[PDB]
Structure 1
């Protein structure tokens, strides 16, 4: 029972689709009796595709064609990284129903691009929560946010500028994905900072923030 990889195919996206499984070149697919969201939280963690959103045990019309049902049973906690960290004891135990397949709609992961500037290390901030790129707001912006986003950018440390280059690097246009983002200084990236809900902003596009480092 070695799940090397669990690809997501037959779906609109790279990591939105049905769950497969790979062992010893045999591409196989997984049914499960207890197939919760935490299993998808594992599955879109070992692939590194965002947080897990939806986990449908949704059947389709029978002419799809499908691989057989994976031999072991996979029930675990969900806080772990890969499909090897939790046990898959009952090998050869196929107690799914007749013709069904699972489905995961985990998010595309957080790609963060500093746009509008001459270099990629200096520009207005733009983030990717959904498929649409969008800026973030400067409500209660702090130097902890600057050092967190520069740590995630992999581009050194902030210098805390005098706001003139940030106002000169562009107002931007589009949508504002984040407002009132608040980083504690220790988070690896911008998702793990406290913020208002994605896309719910009380600011216009004139308040798009820029981080210089």
Structure 2
């Protein structure tokens, strides 16, 4: 019940670097696999419309928190990003240069 998602460093609630609250801390999501299915789940869960793009490679900067998720492979209609298939939690397989991001339609 404590899980939560936000976008940061994008200048709007509805675009930016994806962060998930896990074990007390906001962590980032590695783009080792990242796509618009994943972005659409994020955009929907936040009430931000639909994804227009899903930029990886720390486009919205590198987080400082733990990298909590990687290999996230949503189908696209999941209600929460954590409900999508993913490679457990806290894999330590990535660096922050791979932090994933989203741009949603509701961004202004």
TM-score in terms of structure 1 length: 0.46
CA contact (8 A) 1:125 1:136 kept: yes
Question: For residue 75 of structure 2, what is the aligned residue in structure 1?
Answer: 184
Given the alignment of the two structures, is residue 147 of structure 1 paired with residue 40 of structure 2, yes or no?
A: yes
Question: For residue 118 of structure 1, what is the aligned residue in structure 2?
Answer: 11
Q: Which has the larger radius of gyration?
A: 1
CA contact (8 A) 1:140 1:181 kept: yes
CA contact (8 A) 2:38 2:74 kept: yes
State the SS of the aligned residue for 2:52. Answer: coil
CA contact (8 A) 1:148 1:183 kept: yes
52, 64, 75: which is aligned to 1:173? 64
CA contact (8 A) 2:27 2:63 kept: no
| Gapped regions of structure 1 (runs ≥ 5) | 1-49, 51-107
Runs of 4+ in structure 1 over 3 Å off: none
Structure 1: distance between partners of 2:83 and 2:96: 24
Structure 2: distance between partners of 1:195 and 1:201: 13
Count of aligned pairs: 103
CA contact (8 A) 2:25 2:65 kept: no
Deviation readout 1:154-183 (Å, 9 max, x if unpaired): 11111126x49x62x212222100010110
Deviation readout 1:62-95 (Å, 9 max, x if unpaired): xxxxxxxxxxxxxxxxxxxxxxxxxxxxxxxxxx
Structure 2: distance between partners of 1:152 and 1:143: 14
State the SS of the aligned residue for 2:51. Answer: coil
Structure 2: distance between partners of 1:117 and 1:142: 18
CA contact (8 A) 2:31 2:70 kept: yes
| Gapped regions of structure 2 (runs ≥ 5) | none
Question: For residue 206 of structure 1, what is the aligned residue in structure 2?
Answer: 97
CA contact (8 A) 1:137 1:201 kept: no
1 or 2 for the larger relative contact order (CA 8 Å, sep ≥6)?
Answer: 2
